RNA sequence: CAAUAUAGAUGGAUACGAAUAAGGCGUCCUUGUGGCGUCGCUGAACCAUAGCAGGCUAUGGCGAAUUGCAAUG
RNA sequence: UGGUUCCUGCCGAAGAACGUAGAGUUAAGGUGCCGGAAUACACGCUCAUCAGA
RNA sequence: UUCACUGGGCCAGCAUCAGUUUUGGUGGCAGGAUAAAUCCAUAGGAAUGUAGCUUGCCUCGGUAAGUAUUAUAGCCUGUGGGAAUACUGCCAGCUGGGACUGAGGACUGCGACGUAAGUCAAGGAUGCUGGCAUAAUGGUUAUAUGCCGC
């Protein structure tokens, strides 16, 4: 009634880097509540959402959905790589995107 | 997992939380932090009086904390501006803030991180030996406080012994068992 | 197949938007953030000379041309020339639908009245 | 790395109408065999003129402790290079078993005297037996009678970003 | 018969390394005369030796 | 009123293969290291860094460098298995243990029971 | 969490029940260029396989406490919800 | 144009203070630097949370479908 | 003395030899924040009235 | 003209495969001092000496310091019995998750399972479903973000 959240939030962290050169092709994620690669690979594979509201109505609405998935963690911290089919704005950074639980292996 | 959050900087060293802060507002949590007077310095008054000294050729502990963690945020970048955008700081518990409950990060504590036996650092003592006049004032302020506070939290305990009485008389009923089963 | 491109942009001169005088043709100097022409890039050699819808292009001028591709038309598609009348145009698409070869630029000079 | 006991003999090669020689045993501290054996042969010609190729090794083996339970104390002498002049050095140690003690000990060496596991040649380490053969005053302060003491280092890793407790070193 | 061949060499050898120590001698063992090699370094900055 | 690291001080392993098994301080071996054993929990007698376990302010009296078959008769005759059940901390540790055991239907029965419970309570309440 | 399903017969419907229907006559000329909406209704015998199936499947549900109540609440995600530890 | 959102809404920002080689809570008295017990050892808490994205009626009774197997919907 | 006009391929002197990509693994170098990655773990030492990194 | 069936391309999702890879869970072996330990059996030993006893100060019984080697605790060492486990290695053991890839294009080949006919994970991906003409979708620019650029 109060809730209708199928999904974990988590923030864009960052585009996979060196020092000096970024990939924005692989994208960096955190997922709340996750901070062991273990715990992590329950969210291998799963359906991401970038959910953003746009000014203009395109089909109907004005909120737009960017998609992906997961790859692979990144790091000790349950850091987790993504791709998406278009890669992000990059002024995304920090924002909540959702991460659905489909593909479900339980 | 929480929008605003609220940071109490009495008991704290300066760049660690500075580091946690940093990292936060470029993650995109909104950070207010509070009581900022009584954050703490390593080593002695001295050293760290000269330190202030020799980069000061602004005196709130506010301006201190924020001149330290805009160091750590690329703050030239437009990220970074928003970043610092979502940044309050501030010396006392001002209102509206001093209604809600003031986080600490223990990674940052004096008490966890020094080796007892070591000289630290009041921050408001520095400010105020380096030329901010108004550490009296807060003080003042935060004294009214502690004693509505203490009004508050004498009151609350009260209540929550009626709500911990209703409890106990809730107990033993089959309805507290089946939780007991179910685990609660 | 699925067509390989390798390289979406175009290859530029270094400091060709520095200067009006110089052209954006590609001409080697004699950083490397600059994308160079080389034998890398070459596309695929099933994939080459392949539109988006899939054909090799062929330039047709007249209707004896259009007849060259009787046999091969799910393979190529007709270009019309861009300096034909537009009384032998219609008459190329008319022979080209009744070949059922796909033209890639019908509508060129033309218009549908009533 | 861990480091694990090793007998190692060696026999410096019988020759034509030398048969038999003397099999020379010593007791090695090293993380896997190989360096064992290199440790074996750096001793040994430090003992006489050997070479590795002037002999061979007999027997390569690991030694486990006996009785691994027991809370041991030990008296080792170490040789071992200020990189100009060499000295002996005698240290007596609290240790459960042999290995861990010698672990343990190079750990201290490098600590205070930055010496490397090549500069280190270790002697003998012993158990010492009975009480008060601790010459040390630092492991005789544990040989008390009902010793008890408070933890020091309360501080925990709080594996979180925030605490909503204001924690407290409670002990 | 490969399979049989190394199966009685492995029970053979240890077998006399428990006769070693059965007999309370020692047993030296066969030299192993082949080895893997494995190159660990660039191109660049190699003598030519 | 102060916790020590003494012979029969029965700990609790927070962090190891253990993870939580109750153990008992054998002997020590300095400022950093002791020697434990925990034969009822099944955690063998072992050397430990005192990092990787936590004090219980449960003790009894153990003798020194006691042997395991000794140690078990002292841990069954202090009796204090039944004293760490009893503490509210362990009811706690095990009560967060059965909250990752729920099951969503056992957790829309919690949900259902915690509905109840505050229906009865605030009658309970408002009338006191 | 488990119910039977032997008290129900599922066997008889297929895939190829679940065929969505097609259209003849090019939809007979879209009745003359005139568009008409009564094809919205459901088939009938669905609605009967549906309650054939219902009234066996209750029976098995009414066995259980409060299972019922369960099907009928939905499901989301609460604060704190972490579905990698939260056994299901 | 609007009945909206902009660095990122979709259960809740859910309030003592100090000390840490100490605290808190409850209780008793001799109101103390008293005694007793408790607690921490994480919020993994607590509070809220069923009903067409939450229908219509009286533990009940009717409605949901075809949006056809995911595509903000 | 200064200048000397199209492209590509091949041959070509006096930590890592680099066609174009995808995926993985690593050298060196790092893993408080900028900054990607352990405010890991363990043992000792240093409080400097401008250590040290 | 009646009736019946069917439809291209792209982009997805799923299944079964194959190739690369990553991350799990799990089993059976083989070696050691044929693990060492522990546990059990025995004999001695000692103290950071348990019971007992003696003595002295002292809150009707606490202390202390002698005795006292097990008693009203035990420990250690020696020897004998039995495993188990650790570690290390092997498995042409089982099983799971995630990512990337789909080159090639009638058959031939090596196989394997099959009594047989046949089949197959075996000389490189096929099958099922969804969406799409006021398209689906793709491109162009200008701005913004991030990183790099004298």
Same mark, same amino acid.
């Given at each position: 009634?109060?809730?209708?959240?199928?999904?974990?939030?988590?923030?864009?962290?960052?585009?996979?880097?060196?020092?000096?050169?970024?990939?924005?092709?692989?994208?960096?994620?955190?997922?709340?509540?996750?901070?062991?690669?273990?715990?992590?690979?329950?969210?291998?594979?799963?359906?991401?959402?970038?959910?953003?509201?746009?000014?203009?109505?395109?089909?109907?609405?004005?909120?737009?959905?960017?998609?992906?998935?997961?790859?692979?963690?990144?790091?000790?911290?349950?850091?987790?790589?993504?791709?998406?089919?278009?890669?992000?704005?990059?002024?995304?950074?920090?924002?909540?995107?959702?991460?659905?639980?489909?593909?479900?292996?339980? | 997992?929480?929008?605003?959050?609220?940071?109490?900087? *009495?008991?704290?060293?300066?760049?660690?939380?500075?580091?946690?802060?940093?990292?936060?507002?470029?993650?995109?949590?909104?950070?207010?932090?509070?009581?900022?007077?009584?954050?703490?310095?390593?080593?002695?008054?001295?050293?760290?009086?000269?330190?202030?000294?020799?980069?000061?050729?602004?005196?709130?502990?506010?301006?201190?904390?924020?001149?330290?963690?805009?160091?750590?945020?690329?703050?030239?970048?437009?990220?970074?501006?928003?970043?610092?955008?979502?940044?309050?700081?501030?010396?006392?518990?001002?209102?509206?803030?001093?209604?809600?409950?003031?986080?600490?990060?223990?990674?940052?504590?004096?008490?966890?991180?020094?080796?007892?036996?070591?000289?630290?650092?009041?921050?408001? *003592?520095?400010?105020?030996?380096?030329?901010?006049?108004?550490?009296?004032?807060?003080?003042?302020?935060?004294? *009214?406080?502690?004693?509505?506070?203490?009004?508050?939290?004498?009151?609350?305990?009260?209540?929550?012994?009626?709500?911990?009485?209703?409890?106990?008389?809730?107990?033993?009923?089959?309805?507290?068992?089946?939780?007991?089963?179910?685990?609660? | 197949?699925?067509?390989?491109?390798?390289?979406?942009?175009?290859?530029?001169?270094?400091?060709?938007?520095?200067?009006?005088?110089?052209?954006?043709?590609?001409?080697?100097?004699?950083?490397?953030?600059?994308?160079?022409?080389?034998?890398?890039?070459?596309?695929?050699?099933?994939?080459?000379?392949?539109?988006?819808?899939?054909?090799?292009?062929?330039?047709?001028?007249?209707?004896?041309?259009?007849?060259?591709?009787?046999?091969?038309?799910?393979?190529?598609?007709?270009?019309?020339?861009?300096?034909?009348?537009?009384?032998?145009?219609?008459?190329?698409?008319?022979?080209?639908?009744?070949?059922?070869?796909?033209?890639?630029?019908?509508?060129?000079?033309?218009?549908?009245?009533? | 790395?861990?480091?694990?006991?090793?007998?190692?003999?060696?026999?410096?090669?019988?020759?034509?109408?030398?048969?038999?020689?003397?099999?020379?045993?010593?007791?090695?501290?090293?993380?896997?065999?190989?360096?064992?054996?290199?440790?074996?042969?750096?001793?040994?010609?430090?003992?006489?003129?050997?070479?590795?190729?002037?002999?061979?090794?007999?027997?390569?083996?690991?030694?486990?402790?006996?009785?691994?339970?027991?809370?041991?104390?030990?008296?080792?002498?170490?040789?071992?290079?200020?990189?100009?002049?060499?000295?002996?050095?005698?240290?007596?140690?609290?240790?459960?078993?042999?290995?861990?003690?010698?672990?343990?000990?190079?750990?201290?060496?490098?600590?205070?005297?930055?010496?490397?596991?090549?500069?280190?040649?270790?002697?003998?380490?012993?158990?010492?037996?009975?009480?008060?053969?601790?010459?040390?005053?630092?492991?005789?302060?544990?040989?008390?009678?009902?010793?008890?003491?408070?933890?020091?280092?309360?501080?925990?890793?709080?594996?979180?970003?925030?605490?909503?407790?204001?924690?407290?070193?409670?002990? | 018969?490969?399979?049989?061949?190394?199966?009685?060499?492995?029970?053979?050898?240890?077998?006399?390394?428990?006769?070693?120590?059965?007999?309370?001698?020692?047993?030296?063992?066969?030299?192993?005369?082949?080895?893997?090699?494995?190159?660990?370094?660039?191109?660049?900055?190699?003598?030519?030796? | 009123?102060?916790?020590?690291?003494?012979?029969?001080?029965?700990?609790?392993?927070?962090?190891?293969?253990?993870?939580?098994?109750?153990?008992?301080?054998?002997?020590?071996?300095?400022?950093?290291?002791?020697?434990?054993?925990?034969?009822?929990?099944?955690?063998?007698?072992?050397?430990?860094?005192?990092?990787?376990?936590?004090?219980?302010?449960?003790?009894?009296?153990?003798?020194?460098?006691?042997?395991?078959?000794?140690?078990?008769?002292?841990?069954?005759?202090?009796?204090?298995?039944?004293?760490?059940?009893?503490?509210?901390?362990?009811?706690?540790?095990?009560?967060?243990?059965?909250?990752?055991?729920?099951?969503?239907?056992?957790?829309?029965?919690?949900?259902?029971?915690?509905?109840?419970?505050?229906?009865?309570?605030?009658?309970?309440?408002?009338?006191? | 969490?488990?119910?039977?399903? +032997?008290?129900?017969?599922? +066997?008889?419907?297929?895939?190829?029940?679940?065929?969505?229907?097609?259209?003849?006559?090019? +939809?007979?000329?879209?009745?003359?260029?005139?568009? +008409?909406?009564?094809?919205?209704?459901?088939?009938?015998?669905?609605?009967?396989?549906?309650?054939?199936?219902?009234?066996?499947?209750?029976?098995?549900?009414?066995?259980?406490?409060?299972?019922?109540?369960?099907?009928?609440?939905?499901?989301?995600?609460?604060?704190?919800?972490?579905?990698?530890?939260?056994?299901?």
């Amino acid at each position: 009634a109060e809730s209708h959240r199928l999904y974990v939030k988590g923030k864009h962290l960052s585009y996979q880097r060196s020092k000096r050169v970024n990939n924005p092709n692989v994208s960096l994620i955190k997922i709340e509540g996750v901070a062991t690669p273990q715990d992590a690979q329950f969210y291998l594979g799963k359906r991401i959402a970038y959910v953003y509201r746009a000014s203009k109505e395109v089909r109907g609405s004005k909120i737009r959905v960017m998609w992906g998935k997961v790859t692979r963690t990144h790091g000790n911290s349950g850091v987790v790589r993504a791709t998406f089919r278009n890669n992000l704005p990059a002024k995304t950074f920090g924002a909540s995107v959702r991460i659905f639980l489909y593909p479900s292996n339980i | 997992v929480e929008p605003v959050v609220v940071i109490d900087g *009495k008991g704290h060293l300066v760049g660690r939380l500075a580091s946690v802060v940093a990292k936060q507002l470029l993650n995109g949590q909104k950070i207010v932090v509070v009581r900022a007077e009584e954050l703490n310095i390593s080593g002695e008054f001295f050293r760290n009086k000269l330190k202030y000294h020799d980069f000061l050729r602004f005196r709130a502990p506010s301006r201190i904390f924020y001149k330290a963690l805009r160091g750590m945020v690329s703050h030239k970048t437009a990220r970074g501006k928003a970043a610092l955008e979502r940044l309050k700081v501030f010396e006392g518990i001002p209102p509206p803030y001093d209604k809600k409950k003031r986080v600490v990060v223990p990674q940052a504590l004096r008490v966890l991180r020094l080796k007892p036996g070591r000289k630290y650092t009041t921050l408001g *003592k520095l400010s105020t030996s380096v030329g901010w006049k108004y550490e009296d004032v807060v003080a003042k302020l935060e004294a *009214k406080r502690k004693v509505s506070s203490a009004e508050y939290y004498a009151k609350k305990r009260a209540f929550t012994k009626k709500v911990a009485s209703a409890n106990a008389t809730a107990a033993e009923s089959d309805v507290a068992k089946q939780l007991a089963a179910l685990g609660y | 197949p699925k067509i390989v491109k390798k390289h979406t942009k175009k290859f530029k001169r270094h400091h060709s938007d520095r200067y009006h005088r110089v052209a954006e043709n590609w001409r080697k100097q004699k950083r490397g953030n600059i994308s160079q022409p080389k034998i890398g890039y070459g596309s695929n050699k099933k994939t080459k000379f392949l539109s988006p819808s899939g054909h090799k292009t062929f330039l047709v001028a007249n209707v004896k041309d259009l007849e060259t591709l009787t046999m091969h038309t799910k393979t190529y598609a007709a270009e019309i020339a861009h300096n034909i009348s537009a009384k032998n145009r219609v008459v190329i698409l008319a022979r080209a639908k009744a070949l059922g070869i796909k033209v890639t630029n019908p509508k060129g000079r033309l218009a549908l009245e009533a | 790395a861990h480091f694990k006991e090793y007998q190692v003999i060696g026999r410096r090669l019988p020759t034509e109408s030398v048969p038999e020689p003397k099999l020379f045993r010593m007791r090695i501290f090293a993380s896997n065999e190989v360096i064992a054996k290199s440790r074996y042969w750096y001793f040994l010609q430090k003992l006489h003129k050997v070479k590795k190729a002037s002999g061979e090794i007999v027997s390569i083996n690991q030694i486990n402790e006996a009785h691994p339970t027991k809370v041991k104390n030990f008296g080792v002498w170490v040789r071992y290079d200020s990189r100009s002049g060499t000295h002996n050095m005698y240290k007596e140690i609290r240790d459960v078993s042999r290995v861990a003690a010698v672990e343990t000990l190079y750990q201290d060496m490098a600590a205070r005297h930055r010496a490397r596991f090549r500069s280190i040649h270790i002697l003998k380490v012993a158990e010492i037996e009975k009480t008060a053969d601790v010459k040390r005053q630092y492991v005789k302060q544990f040989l008390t009678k009902d010793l008890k003491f408070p933890l020091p280092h309360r501080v925990q890793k709080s594996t979180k970003t925030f605490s909503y407790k204001r924690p407290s070193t409670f002990y | 018969a490969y399979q049989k061949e190394y199966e009685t060499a492995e029970r053979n050898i240890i077998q006399a390394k428990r006769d070693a120590k059965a007999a309370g001698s020692y047993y030296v063992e066969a030299q192993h005369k082949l080895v893997f090699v494995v190159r660990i370094k660039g191109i660049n900055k190699i003598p030519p030796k | 009123n102060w916790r020590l690291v003494e012979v029969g001080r029965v700990v609790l392993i927070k962090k190891g293969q253990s993870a939580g098994k109750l153990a008992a301080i054998v002997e020590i071996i300095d400022q950093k290291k002791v020697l434990i054993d925990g034969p009822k929990a099944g955690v063998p007698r072992q050397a430990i860094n005192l990092g990787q376990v936590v004090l219980t302010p449960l003790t009894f009296a153990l003798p020194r460098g006691a042997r395991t078959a000794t140690v078990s008769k002292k841990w069954a005759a202090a009796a204090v298995c039944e004293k760490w059940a009893a503490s509210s901390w362990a009811k706690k540790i095990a009560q967060r243990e059965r909250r990752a055991a729920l099951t969503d239907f056992e957790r829309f029965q919690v949900m259902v029971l915690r509905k109840q419970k505050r229906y009865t309570v605030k009658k309970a309440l408002a009338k006191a | 969490t488990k119910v039977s399903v +032997e008290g129900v017969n599922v +066997e008889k419907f297929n895939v190829e029940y679940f065929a969505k229907e097609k259209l003849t006559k090019k +939809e007979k000329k879209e009745a003359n260029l005139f568009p +008409e909406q009564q094809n919205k209704e459901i088939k009938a015998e669905r609605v009967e396989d549906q309650k054939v199936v219902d009234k066996a499947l209750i029976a098995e549900i009414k066995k259980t406490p409060l299972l019922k109540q369960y099907l009928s609440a939905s499901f989301s995600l609460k604060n704190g919800d972490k579905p990698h530890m939260l056994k299901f």
